[PDB]
Antibody, heavy 224, light 211 residues
Framework: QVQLQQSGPGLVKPSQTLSLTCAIS??????????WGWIRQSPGRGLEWLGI?????????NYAVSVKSRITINPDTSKNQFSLQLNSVTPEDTAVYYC????????????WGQGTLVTVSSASTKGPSVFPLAPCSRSTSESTAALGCLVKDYFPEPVTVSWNSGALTSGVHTFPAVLQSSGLYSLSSVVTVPSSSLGTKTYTCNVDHKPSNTKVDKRVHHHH | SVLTQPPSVSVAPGQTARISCSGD??????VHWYQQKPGQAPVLVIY???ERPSGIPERFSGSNSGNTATLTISGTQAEDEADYYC??????????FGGGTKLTVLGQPKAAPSVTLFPPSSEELQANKATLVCLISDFYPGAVTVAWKADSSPVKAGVETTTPSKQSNNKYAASSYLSLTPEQWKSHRSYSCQVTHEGSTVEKTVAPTEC
């Protein structure tokens, strides 16, 4: 059939040059019956067209507006490949990159590459700062209150959060971390607790980040 | 050009799903439809407004007229659950995609999101930093739109929002983070976390005057 093999580094330092290669098999890059281009997709986001090339009377190209100043798509008529090059990269260029074949005449895409996840990050291994999560002017009316811990700015995954040294497992909800533009992760863990015992009962999170040797306990101070 | 799609469409097994793709005179050019499942490259399901390529089940159908292109699925199967993107062509750019639409096939009752908003802690303020934490849990289907506000004006700067993920109860969780300076936190009188889940917006609000 037609095969599209993507190639290139998965990690790029910010403000550097992102470079990928789509090796074609079962067709020619200089085909008069097809067009070749790149499409990217930020994690948890939607598709976005980057650029395209095709050989008619001569080689033509069309680039999306926002990358046009930085993007370059070059057909390698030797190795039967076509490349993608992004100058001056930034964390918002972090995405999954798909190369694709546009079929004439409707320019529909019948073939894709396997897609390569490229991260734009200079993040170093770092220990998180653990801050308490507690509502200020609470004044509850229900038998349930929420408290937790903010595990901010760490690298890399994972981080283990426990409550009261493992004695508190019920009502515990640790959320999947976020990947900020900085390249660092932030995570939250919260507990659903009875509000009738907030005055006597205590709650402490036990955050552990092994790569940086972070062993921090943090008592979540209840406001009243 | 911009092709507007609904962020989410839910449907019970065997019922009809309709996914819109609005745009200024998008009926003047052909529209393609792509299906995308997590971890996979997209798959063409409809080309030339309404044509199905080989292999694509006949329960998929397409339409395009005026300012609305619609992908319709009859007797939606569980396997039809994916992301659906529409695409067309304006000028001079060659290709534009719609924002996308998560299609969910109901395997459990719909569930409104639980939203909790935490203010920055005094420890973080001491460290000359400020962070607002908005936590969203137990919602189904797993698609939400998070909108932050300062007083009444929308805020996009410093907003990091995660991708929805399945919980141990088969429901979904997500969280949004707003990074601020303490001066910013002390300047504005209020901050809000708006969470829209299928046309229903749950709002939580914190203020620096609460402590």
């Amino acid at each position: 059939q037609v095969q599209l093999q993507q190639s290139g580094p998965g990690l790029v330092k910010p403000s550097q040059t992102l470079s990928l290669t789509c090796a074609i098999s079962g067709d020619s890059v200089s085909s008069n019956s097809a067009a070749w281009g790149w499409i990217r997709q930020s994690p948890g986001r939607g598709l976005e067209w980057l650029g395209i090339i095709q050989k008619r009377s001569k080689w033509y190209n069309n680039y999306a507006v926002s990358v046009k100043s930085r993007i370059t798509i070059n057909p390698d008529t030797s190795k039967n490949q076509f490349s993608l090059q992004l100058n001056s990269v930034t964390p918002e260029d972090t995405a999954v990159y798909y190369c694709a074949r546009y079929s004439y005449p409707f320019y529909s895409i019948d073939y894709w590459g396997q897609g390569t996840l490229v991260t734009v990050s200079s993040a170093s291994t770092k220990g998180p700062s653990v801050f308490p999560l507690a509502p200020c002017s609470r004044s509850t009316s229900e038998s349930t209150a929420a408290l937790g811990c903010l595990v901010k700015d760490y690298f890399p995954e994972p981080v283990t959060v426990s409550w009261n040294s493992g004695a508190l497992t019920s009502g515990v909800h640790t959320f999947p971390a976020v990947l900020q533009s900085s390249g660092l992760y932030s995570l939250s863990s919260v507990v659903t607790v009875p509000s009738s015992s907030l005055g006597t009962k205590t709650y402490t999170c036990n955050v552990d980040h092994k790569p940086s040797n972070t062993k921090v306990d943090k008592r979540v101070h209840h406001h009243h | 050009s911009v092709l507007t799609q609904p962020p989410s469409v839910s449907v019970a097994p065997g019922q009809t799903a309709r996914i819109s793709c609005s745009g200024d005179n998008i009926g003047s050019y052909y529209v393609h439809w792509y299906q995308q499942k997590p971890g996979q490259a997209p798959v063409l399901v409809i080309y030339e407004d309404s044509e199905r390529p080989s292999g694509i089940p006949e329960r998929f159908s397409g339409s395009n007229s005026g300012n609305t292109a619609t992908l319709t699925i009859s007797g939606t199967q569980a396997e039809d659950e994916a992301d659906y993107y529409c695409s067309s062509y304006d000028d001079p750019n060659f290709q534009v995609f719609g924002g996308g639409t998560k299609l969910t096939v109901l395997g459990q009752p719909k569930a409104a999101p639980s939203v909790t908003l935490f203010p920055p802690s005094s420890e973080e303020l001491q460290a000359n930093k400020a962070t607002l934490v908005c936590l969203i849990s137990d919602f189904y289907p797993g698609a939400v739109t998070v909108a932050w506000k300062a007083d009444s004006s929308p805020v996009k700067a410093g907003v990091e929002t995660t991708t929805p993920s399945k919980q141990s109860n088969n429901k979904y969780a997500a969280s949004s983070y707003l990074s601020l300076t303490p001066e910013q936190w002390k300047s504005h009188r209020s901050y809000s976390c708006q969470v829209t889940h299928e046309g229903s917006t749950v709002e939580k609000t914190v203020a620096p005057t609460e402590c």
